[PDB]
Amino acid sequence: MAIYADNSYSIGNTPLVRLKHFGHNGNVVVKIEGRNPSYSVKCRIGANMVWQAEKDGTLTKGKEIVEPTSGNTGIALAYVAAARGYKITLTMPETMSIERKRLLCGLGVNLVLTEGAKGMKGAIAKAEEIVASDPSRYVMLKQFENPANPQIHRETTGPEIWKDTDGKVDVVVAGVGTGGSITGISRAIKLDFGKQITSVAVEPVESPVISQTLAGEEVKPGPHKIQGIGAGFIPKNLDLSIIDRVETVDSDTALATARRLMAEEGILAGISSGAAVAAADRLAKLPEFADKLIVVILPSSS
């Protein structure tokens, strides 16, 4: 019997689809993380961070989840919290989408909106205040540094890719937000299955902090339009040691690529999906990668 006890267990087993108007003779294949509870990759880390907090006793009946997240992590935690019966508080700037506020409210989140001028720093600050006010009551899962993030990718996302490609996958391209996807995937394929694939991080040209760091240059973040990626810092969940290459993509190209995925491939992916594909396409059209099977994470849906 293939029935899930709750919606948290239903994560993953996302499909690989071949692109027809990207790459060279279908050397580019996409993994559609849009096909998940809460419509993004974050469903996996949402599920596993909660599961892990349960196993280690940091999360019990009565204790509340608190997390600062402007994005899909909040949505993921909301779904899992509802599916597993936890109260949850999320903090972010008043400067959010009314659709996200409403959907988050719909999901049963105690929403706490911080000054828009103060940005995500204000939201971390506030989340920290809330936990500090009653440490026995509130648990911060800390998506950027919690090992349960890349662990789920090593246990599910990566093995799915290995399985689906009969281990013929040669290159994995993934935008970096928390870094968990690239970390966990790379660890699975390289460490557990033992194939020396090329792991390609993607980040905005507008905020190329990984590229700058690896070049030994001054780190100079900037604002960009590609949601999900470009934190403006190297997260603790980004394992530099497994990264073979870093490609930068600009906002406009990422957006054009997302639109092309929709109109040409019939795939409903978000801007960060566009970024990932733009980067993969670049490498796919180098002779050196002409006979390599390239797997691209599409993190979310449109």
Partner: peptide, 8 residues
């Protein structure tokens, strides 16, 4: 993420 310290 959704926003680490960037975006829009």
């Amino acid at each position: 993420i959704g926003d680490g310290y960037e975006f829009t």
